C-alpha cells in the first residue's frame, strides 16, 4: 500500500538530511565551535529515521539507523542512551540479522555490566541464549549464557528464576547424553522445592524425572534412588509415578519388554507424553 513507498521515500529523505547535517557539523564546529547541539539534533533525526523504518517493516534499515545513533551518541560520552540504542538495535536486528543483534546485545551487556546493573545484563544473556537455542543448534552457547544468567540472578538473591534456568540447562544436558549434571540439578531443585507449600505439589514431578534420568546409568542405582526418594519424600509414594517405575523395573528384570511397552502405552493413553520423556523411554527400551 501507500505505507511501503511513502515511508521508504520519506525515511530516505530524512536519512540523507541527517547525513548532510552530520557532514556539515564538522565544518560548523571548526568554524564556530557550536558544541554538541548539532550532534544531538542529528541523533534525534537518526532515531526518527529508525522509528519510521520500523513502521515501514524494513527491519534492517531501522536496526542500522539505531546502530549509527548508538555509535554517534556513545561518541558524545552518553553511555546510557548509547546502550538504549544498542538494545533497540539488538531487538530490531533479532529477526532480520541475528548475528548483528547478537553483537549489539553483547555490547549492551558490556555497557550495562560496566555500571553493575546485573539484572539487565542477565536479561540480555537470557535473550541471547533463547535466540541461540531457537535459531541455532549450538547448544553449548545457550547453556553458557543460561548458566551466566543464573549466576547473575543468584548474586542478586532473586530465587525462583535461577531455578528455571538451571532446570532448562539440566534437561538440555540430559538430552546431550550427560546425566550426572542433570541428576544433580534435578535433585537440587527438588530439595529446594520440598519445603515450599506451593511448589511441593510439583516437586514430585522433578523427583520422577530425576529417577528416570538415573535409569540409563544402571538398574541397581535406579532401584536404590527409587528407595531414597520414597524414604526422603514419603508423599511421593502416593503418586502413580512410583507404581510406574516399579512396573517398568519389574518388566526389565525378566526381559519382559512387552509389559514395558503395554504400561507405557496405557500411561500415554491416560495422559499424552512429552518428547523428552518419549525419547528417554525409547532409549532405555533399546536394552
Amino acid at each position: 500500500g501507500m505505507d511501503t513507498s511513502g515511508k521508504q521515500a520519506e525515511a530516505m529523505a530524512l536519512l540523507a538530511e541527517a547525513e548532510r547535517k552530520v557532514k556539515n557539523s564538522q565544518s560548523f564546529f571548526s568554524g564556530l565551535f557550536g558544541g554538541s547541539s548539532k550532534i544531538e539534533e542529528a541523533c534525534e533525526i537518526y532515531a526518527r529515521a529508525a522509528n519510521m523504518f520500523k513502521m515501514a517493516k524494513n527491519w534492517s534499515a531501522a536496526g542500522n539507523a539505531f546502530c549509527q545513533a548508538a555509535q554517534l551518541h556513545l561518541q558524545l560520552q552518553s553511555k546510557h542512551d548509547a546502550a538504549t540504542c544498542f538494545v533497540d538495535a539488538g531487538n530490531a536486528f533479532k529477526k532480520a540479522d541475528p548475528q548483528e543483534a547478537i553483537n549489539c546485545l553483547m555490547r549492551a551487556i558490556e555497557i550495562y555490566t560496566d555500571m553493575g546493573r546485573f539484572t539487565i545484563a542477565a536479561k540480555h544473556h537470557i535473550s541471547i541464549a533463547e535466540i541461540y537455542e531457537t535459531e541455532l543448534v549450538d547448544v553449548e552457547k545457550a547453556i553458557a549464557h543460561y548458566e551466566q544468567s543464573a549466576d547473575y540472578y543468584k548474586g542478586e538473591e532473586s530465587n525462583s528464576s535461577a531455578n528455571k534456568c538451571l532446570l532448562k540447562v539440566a534437561g538440555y544436558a540430559a538430552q546431550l547424553e550427560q546425566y550426572q549434571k542433570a541428576i544433580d540439578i534435578y535433585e537440587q531443585v527438588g530439595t529446594s522445592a520440598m519445603d515450599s507449600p506451593l511448589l511441593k505439589y510439583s516437586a514430585k514431578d522433578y523427583f520422577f524425572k530425576a529417577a528416570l534420568c538415573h535409569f540409563c546409568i544402571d538398574m541397581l542405582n535406579a532401584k536404590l534412588a527409587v528407595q531414597k526418594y520414597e524414604e526422603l519424600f514419603p508423599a511421593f509414594s502416593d503418586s502413580r509415578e512410583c507404581k510406574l517405575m516399579k512396573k517398568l523395573l519389574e518388566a526389565h528384570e525378566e526381559q519382559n519388554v512387552d509389559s514395558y511397552t503395554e504400561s507405557v502405552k496405557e500411561y500415554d493413553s491416560i495422559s499424552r507424553l512429552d518428547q523428552w520423556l518419549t525419547t528417554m523411554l525409547l532409549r532405555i527400551k533399546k536394552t
Binding site: 544402571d218 541397581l220 542405582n221 536404590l224
Partner: protein, 104 residues
Amino acid sequence: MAGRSMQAARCPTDELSLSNCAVVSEKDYQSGQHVIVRTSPNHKYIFTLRTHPSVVPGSVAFSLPQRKWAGLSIGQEIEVALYSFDKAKQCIGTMTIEIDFLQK
C-alpha cells in the same frame, strides 16, 4: 591385612559368575584368598577371591547373585580386607540348601 578402599565392578565372564566367587586382579589379590567386604559399619560380607586379568586394577568384580545378596552396585565404593577363616571352628562339616528354580 589392614584393608583398603576399592571400587565395585561387574563380573567379567559367565564361568566366574557361576563360580560364586569375587573376581579380582592379580596385582591386588590372589585366587583363593578370603576377603571381608565392608559397605557400612553393620554390613560386612566374606568372599573368596579368584583372579582374572580383565579386572581393572582398583576394582572388584561381583556376579549378579552377589550384587543382589549384598546389594552391591557398579561403581560403588567398598572396603576390602584380606580374611582368614578359623579352620579350627569355621570349617564346614554340614550345610543345608533350599534349592529352587532360578529360571521359572
